[PDB]
Symmetry: C2
Subunit: 164 residues, 2 copies
């Protein structure tokens, strides 16, 4: 259960897609490996990922070495500027309890310090009390509820109508 | 008017508008950013400005939108609209609508499958403006709540 945390490289795309699908089980993953490569390793990456890698004696049954990841990117708020935005954070069930999640959060926090980011933002489902409390124990606050902010989206078919 | 990408020169007008919007959101005291930050961080975000052929004191910029790109593991590249504001005397169809059309064009070029943004609970004018264009409330539909861990707490985790 030796593991190392490191940035993902282009060579890790199939593993990232595999983990995203694992994460979906806790939902229609349409992203492809091709998407992960072009969106993550071009001149202007749309996301960054830290992955957890284990040696062979602990590879998964399918024979894989990447057992966890955190996908994040930098955002901005006009009030304070730069923020680190944590999009997803997942460690395979059989690899939890060994310190992988804690080291990932530590490294994400160090990256935030390097960035001079003022805060780390992320979404939590309102009903997921266990997760809410996990983050509250780390100093989190529910900005949506405290300040009265709701998240909205406008999907592709509408953007197309407006664009044409 | 015309909707166009901002230039370094527009940093002064963008800050002025950010502060007007902040007052509308009951957050003007929280704007700690400067024209200097806007310049260094933007030339982490992109801005569109609405320029007219001028306000009574001589400003040509009367609206703006600030956006950046984000990522969703299920579907890819997304466009995120951070702030959107049109000066009072310049509202009355066209600008806000054209800003959204320009943002939609940006999304089409990125092959962004959705545009996300936040809206205040009581902001019926914006809620309706977006809903008239097809927007859906994800906080309602998917139950999402935005959480934050500020720097003092990130420092605790970084240093153990």
């Amino acid at each position: 259960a030796k593991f190392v945390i490191r940035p993902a490289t282009a060579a890790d795309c199939s593993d990232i897609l595999r983990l995203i699908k694992e994460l979906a089980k806790y939902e229609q993953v349409i992203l492809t490996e091709k998407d992960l490569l072009e969106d993550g390793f071009g001149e202007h990456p749309f996301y960054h990922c830290l992955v957890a890698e284990v040696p062979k004696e602990h590879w998964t049954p399918e024979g894989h070495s990447i057992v966890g990841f955190a996908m994040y990117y930098f955002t901005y708020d006009p009030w304070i500027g730069k923020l680190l935005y944590l999009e997803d954070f997942f460690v395979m069930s059989d690899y939890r309890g060994f310190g992988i999640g804690s080291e990932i959060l530590k490294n994400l926090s160090q990256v935030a310090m390097r960035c001079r980011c003022s805060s780390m933002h992320f979404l939590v489902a309102e009903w997921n009390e266990p997760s809410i409390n996990f983050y509250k124990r780390r100093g989190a606050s529910d900005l949506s509820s405290e300040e009265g902010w709701r998240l909205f989206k406008i999907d592709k078919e509408y953007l197309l109508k407006m664009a044409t």
